[PDB]
Design a protein around this nucleic acid. Structure first.
Ligand SMILES: NC[C@@H]1O[C@H](O[C@H]2[C@@H](O)[C@H](O[C@@H]3[C@@H](O)[C@H](N)C[C@H](N)[C@H]3O[C@H]3O[C@H](CO)[C@@H](O)[C@H](O)[C@H]3N)O[C@@H]2CO)[C@H](N)[C@@H](O)[C@@H]1O
Ligand SMILES: [Mg+2]
Ligand SMILES: [Mg+2]
Ligand SMILES: [Mg+2]
Ligand SMILES: [Mg+2]
Ligand SMILES: [Mg+2]
Ligand SMILES: [Mg+2]
Lengths: 183, 50, 156, 260
RNA sequence: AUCUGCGCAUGGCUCAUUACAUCAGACGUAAUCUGCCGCAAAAAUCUUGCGGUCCGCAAAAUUGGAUAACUUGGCGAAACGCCAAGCUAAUACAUGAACCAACCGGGUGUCUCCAGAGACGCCCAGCGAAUGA
RNA sequence: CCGGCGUCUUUUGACGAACAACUGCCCUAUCAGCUGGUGAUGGCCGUGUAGUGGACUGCCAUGGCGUUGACGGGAGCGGGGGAUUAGGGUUCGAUUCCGGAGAGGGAGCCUGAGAAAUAGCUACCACUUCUACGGAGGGCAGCAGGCGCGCAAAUUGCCCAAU
């Protein structure tokens, strides 16, 4: 079938390699997943050793991490914003690793009110908020799009391999990199 | 056209060979598998069966 | 007081349509520990490879973002350690080294000049000119032909 | 998946004659390596003559009558190798697999107290789940809580009845080893100097009881005591001393003439 | 006789292919899969019974549905071809174990104290896997 | 009460698998340029894999190999080894052991820990057997044999007693 060998590749001299075996099963590749936005549908793939590799088709949600705060929240993917491979993969809204997506931002605001106590008053007994909040500060570009409603984020998992759409929120120079390329 | 008729309340399946003239009246291009047909299409001795 | 003032984009390294970052460490930590931060400023991943090779001045204090690099990536140097001379540096971040050896013929009691050429990945820690003698260490496949990776450059 | 050995591709230390059949009993995976073991069909039939063929040989083994390290082994293809203890309760004999100085496997007869302990060399150390540091051994054992001074090159004394690591022997300069591979296999010597060479094979220089100096790779040496007098285990009848090929050839002619 | 569990990827033949291939000596896999075999590991899971309409008292958890062989009726010239119905197993398939029975940790609301400390309550805390720190 | 087993998961040694390539290799120039649009050498995100990787999509760069014989053509499995040999050599290696490859040619798969399996499946091509014409099957480079082909190579034998 699809193979991953160098039998069809030309030599560095430019010479053709003459083939004297059949294709092996141990050198196969398989058809790509092309994971998109949509309600979750997965198909497992029986890999070597009997292990299962879960193809992701049509994913809509994942655990996205806010790395300065070292937390994650299960949020819902909204749109696919920028892809470094092609602009055609943005238009069909394919989920790959490292593509830039927008996520829900509601569990992140709610966590930022429950932890640090800052909204965008009720437990007067526990002001361990004051034990934090002094040294720590929050980047302004995060807090703008956090209250705007959707946060740009980066996919850190391989969905056709794992069947998950986990990610990380863009911070720092990495957010300021991709904000220039969009607008 | 032979016909096995089974009565699973008692088991005891028996076979009854349907004549040509009893089948020439039936259009027969309906009646695929799964259908609950009237039994009298297999001859009118099987009147009122499903 | 709530705002953090994160680092600005360093356009000298950022050329490549995706953001160039190191997978080993996060660039965006607010109170990053003294583990991976270098002398001047920024967070950096630098690794000590095995066999008594000293990491260069760059890859600790440089600014470049290299994957496939032995000092700043998950590329491990293992197996053979060899030497060659630099032949061509025309490829981007890859050199071709030349290994010249004498092949003894048992019949005619005389040697014979042969050579092997190897494509070797060259880190931006190093700038070898043609004729420079390098030390290469074997790693995983990094391309169709790259199996080795430069560890030290001996000038001229 | 190989399942057969040819009797020519079998190891030479088993001493199976080439004219008796095409095949040799391929030892299963298990404790010891295929190149470096002596499977229990060869011990029961070819070493000990308790069995005249392989059909009498599984009447012994499948019945549960041979114990390798206190546990009955019903496999004729079970790999028994170096430092293993083979008991038989019915015939009342128990043996230890050692290398003799010509490199071959030798069955050293044992007492009851000497047959409880075996000496095992660490091959890997790692941390398992929990935070339990286990020690991987050449015989395939995974001792879970070893002596905290265990390093990789060391030797653990084990006591296979009550599965408790009773002792440790570090690998240092002042110790005595037995060589379990290479040309020098079966020889016993003090350690002289260990040449490190990181990234490659450690070389260990060794001096014998007579003073014969010889070297091996340090993955081939197996430390068995604090000195050549205070060995932790009993060794075969030459005791690691390799006589000259001329002098040992003269002595057999002298012994054969003096016998008649 | 058939379900079930392993095996049939070995062995045996042949040498057509084949020159940065195969192969030999020597290395690498930290780039990885690995049944059988060896030594080990294992504290996740509100399940049963009886009574009442969700609770109570109990405890060696006495769990559930289906198929072969078989019988019956057979189709077909045949086929290492087949159909339908009726039975019945499990180490097949599916379901499922409270308390005995630990240590350790995180997030968090009332209550005795001092000018932050304790008790109690709730959510979560197993091996493996994903992502982030 | 106790002892033999048998089984999920988890983990590692072992027996392996798969990949990578340090040095080596018959003749040919009446074969001097080879590769690169449709991957050729490299780089960046991915994808795919059991995994590395132009293996593969997108994009960018302009490389890489060669008179130290590339490229193309002919001979044909590779070693251990055999024959001859004062020394240097010259030859043979289909063949028992190791490895690689194939099962009529060529694909493509399922199942499984492992197959691109062939006394497994699917299809086409070339031959091909049974039919009651509706249909159903074949795969000896396994062992005996058979016909051809040739200068040229045996028994449609007995047995698991040994390995
Ligand atoms: N040359 C091998 C490679 O083929 C690739 O391209 C190939 C494909 O585009 C295409 O190959 C197709 C293949 O896709 C398709 N799935 C099957 C088809 N048999 C192939 O076709 C090829 O093979 C057959 C038989 O040799 C020929 O008759 C046919 O003309 C030829 N184009 O034709 C090209 C080969 O001529 C790439 N160009 C490149 O990687 C490389 O050239
Ligand atoms: Mg079965
Ligand atoms: Mg030859
Ligand atoms: Mg890549
Ligand atoms: Mg062979
Ligand atoms: Mg054809
Ligand atoms: Mg034949």
């Amino acid at each position: 079938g699809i193979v991953r060998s160098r039998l069809h590749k030309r030599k560095i001299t430019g010479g053709k390699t003459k083939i004297h075996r059949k294709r092996m099963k141990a050198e196969l590749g398989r058809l790509p997943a092309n994971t998109r936005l949509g309600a979750r549908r997965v198909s497992p793939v029986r890999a070597r050793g009997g292990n299962f590799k879960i193809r992701a088709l049509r994913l809509d949600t994942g655990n996205f991490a806010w790395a300065s705060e070292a937390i994650a929240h299960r949020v819902r993917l909204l749109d696919v914003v920028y892809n470094a491979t092609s602009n055609e993969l943005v238009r069909t809204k394919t989920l790959v690793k490292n593509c830039i997506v927008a996520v829900d931002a509601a569990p992140f605001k709610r966590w930022y009110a429950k932890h640090y106590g800052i909204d965008l008053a009720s437990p007067k007994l526990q002001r361990e908020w004051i034990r934090r909040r002094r040294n720590h500060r929050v980047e302004k570009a995060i807090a703008d799009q956090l209250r705007e409603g959707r946060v740009l984020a980066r996919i850190t998992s391989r969905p056709g391999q794992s069947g998950r759409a986990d990610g990380i929120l863009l911070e720092g120079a990495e957010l300021q990199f991709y904000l220039k390329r969009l607008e | 056209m032979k016909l096995n008729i089974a009565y699973p309340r008692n088991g005891t399946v028996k076979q009854f060979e349907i004549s040509d003239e009893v089948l020439r009246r039936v259009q027969l291009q309906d009646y695929r598998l799964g259908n609950e047909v009237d039994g009298a299409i297999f001859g009118s001795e099987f009147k009122g069966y499903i | 007081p709530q705002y953090y003032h994160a680092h600005q984009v360093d356009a000298t390294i950022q050329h490549q349509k995706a953001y160039q970052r190191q997978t080993a460490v996060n660039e965006n930590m607010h109170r990053s520990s003294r583990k991976h931060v270098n002398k001047s400023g920024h967070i950096r991943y630098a690794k000590k490879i095995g066999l008594g090779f000293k990491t260069p001045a760059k890859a600790l204090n440089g600014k470049y973002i290299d994957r496939k690099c032995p000092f700043t990536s998950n590329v491990v140097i293992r197996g053979r350690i060899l030497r060659g001379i630099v032949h061509s540096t025309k490829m981007h971040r890859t050199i071709v080294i030349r290994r010249n050896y004498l092949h003894f013929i048992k019949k005619y009691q005389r040697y014979q000049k042969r050579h092997k050429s190897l494509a070797v990945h060259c880190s931006p820690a190093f700038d070898p000119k043609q004729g420079d003698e390098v030390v290469v260490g074997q790693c995983r496949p990094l391309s169709k032909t790259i199996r080795y990776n430069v560890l030290e450059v001996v000038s001229k | 998946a190989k399942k057969h050995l040819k009797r020519l591709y079998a190891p030479k230390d088993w001493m199976l004659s080439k004219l008796t059949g095409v095949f040799a009993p391929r030892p299963r995976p298990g404790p010891h390596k295929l190149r470096e073991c002596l499977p229990l069909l060869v011990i029961i039939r070819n070493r000990l003559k308790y069995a005249l063929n392989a059909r009498e040989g599984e009447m012994i083994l499948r019945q549960g009558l041979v114990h390798v390290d206190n546990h009955p082994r019903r496999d004729g293809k079970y790999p028994a190798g170096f430092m293993d203890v083979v008991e038989i309760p019915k015939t009342g004999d128990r043996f230890r697999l050692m290398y003799d100085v010509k490199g071959r496997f030798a069955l050293v007869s044992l007492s009851e107290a000497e047959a409880q302990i075996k000496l095992m060399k660490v091959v890997n150390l790692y941390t398992a789940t929990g935070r339990v540091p286990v020690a991987v051994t050449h015989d395939g054992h995974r001792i879970r809580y070893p002596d905290p001074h265990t390093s990789i090159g060391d030797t653990i004394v084990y006591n296979v009845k009550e599965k408790k690591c009773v002792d440790l022997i570090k690998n240092r300069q002042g110790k005595a080893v037995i060589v379990t591979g290479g040309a020098n296999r079966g020889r016993i010597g003090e350690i002289v100097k260990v040449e490190c060479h990181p990234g490659a094979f450690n070389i260990a220089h060794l001096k014998d009881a007579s003073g014969a100096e010889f070297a091996t790779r340090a993955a081939n040496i197996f430390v068995i005591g604090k000195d050549l007098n205070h060995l932790q285990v009993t060794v075969p009848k030459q005791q690691g001393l390799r006589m000259n090929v001329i002098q040992e050839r003269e002595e057999r002619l002298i012994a054969a003439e003096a016998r008649k």
